[PDB]
Amino acid sequence: AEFDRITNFGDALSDIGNKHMITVDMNQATSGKIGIRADKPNFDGRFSNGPVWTEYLAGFLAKPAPVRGHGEIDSQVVLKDQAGKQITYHYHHNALPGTNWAVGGAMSGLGNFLDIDAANGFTAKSGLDVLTNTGQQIKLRIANKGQFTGNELVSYMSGTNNLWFTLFGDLDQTGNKAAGFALTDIETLIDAGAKQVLAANIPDFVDAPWFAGQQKKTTRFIQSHNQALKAGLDQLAAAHPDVEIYYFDAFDLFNKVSNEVKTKGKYQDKELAITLTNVTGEAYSYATGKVIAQPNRNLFWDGLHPTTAMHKIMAKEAASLVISGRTL
User: Among 118, 162, 239, 257, which is most buried by a count of CB atoms within 10 Å?
Assistant: First the structure.
């Protein structure tokens, strides 16, 4: 056989609950002073209305379902109430053994990042930067579990948040610069013994509701990133002939589904029991909580994250890429 288990790295497209549960635990530990990410109506801490693509993937390949994992978390969380009284917490959680190390918000590269808010009248000064970037996930997986054995498929899907925090934060990355961080991370996997790598590019988010009024900037970033990533993976595959690399072209899949819905009115897959009829709107509004009656007719759940229907479509394409043995 080629592999017994799947290991996942990346962001909210892959995460089965780390960003959610870390904030649940920090909220408990501070008696409600930290806001919960991926609350209801999101499904069990997924940034979706049901399972994400890494869950369908394990089903399709008949491998064990993802197990949420992370390393030790430790931080001095400093908050202030509206009166400006400072409150300090020692937040700690032991490592969590698992196989899916993805965390919503994560960027390609190393280190930790800030994507958690204080709540109920408090404001965070310091120490909420407890979430790990994709390259940091890999570093902590290696420390916790050692090098890969070769019996795993390792999925890597990152870069969306390198775009996100360039548009809406102080990150100042080109698509090619962000792609370089991804390739550095993927090379770390290889040097850690990974022999089967499922590397995904950035989806075609041209129509994502949260990117409205940024279409030229997102096309530039996502096009730049994906062609740099492809070329880099072609080079890595060249230099590492004992590694099988599958390039999940999530971009083209999003593009194809979208154009099918726009030009024929639907994208339907009878094998998956899915019919999409909307690829331009959110099924669910973050701001108001409201959800349309039939969210699984949409590509987009909120303004960026796919619905569980679209995650199923993504995993079928990835599973069939792996089954097809069409490696780089």
Answer: 162
CB 119 within 8 A of CB 32: yes
As beta bridge partners, residue 155 has 8, 198
Q: Which helix (H) or strand (E) holds 25?
A: helix 18-29
The pair of structure tokens assigned to 225 is 């990133």
The span from the CA of 26 to the CA of 24, in Å, is 6
For 100, counting Cβ atoms within 10 Å of its Cβ (0-12 exposed, 13-18 middle, 19+ buried), the class is buried
Resolved by: X-ray
Which two three-digit tokens encode residue 104? Answer: 């919503």
* Residue position matching structure tokens 């869950």: 55
| Distance of alpha carbon 61 from alpha carbon 290, whole angstroms | 35
Resolution (Å) of this entry = 1.7
With a CB cutoff of 8 Å and minimum separation 6, the contacts of 304 are: 160, 164, 205, 208, 209, 210, 211
Q: 104 burial class (0-12, 13-18, 19+ CB within 10 angstroms)?
A: buried
Query: SS3 for 126?
Result: strand
Sign of CA dihedral 244, 138, 18, 214: negative
Spatial neighbors of 301 by CB under 8 A, at least 6 apart, are: 47, 48, 49, 282, 283, 284, 295, 307, 308
**CA separation for the pair 142, 242 (Å, rounded):** 20
Residue 77: helix, strand or coil by DSSP? strand
Residues 6+ apart with CB under 8 A from 269: 275, 313, 316
For residue 222 the two structure tokens come to 């996502």
**Angle subtended by helix axes 175-191 and 134-145, to nearest 10:** 10
Residue 145: φ, ψ to 5°: -125, -5
Which residue has 């479509």 as its token pair? 313
Here the tokens at position 126 are 């310091």
SS3 155: strand
Residue 80's H or E segment, with its range, is: strand 73-80
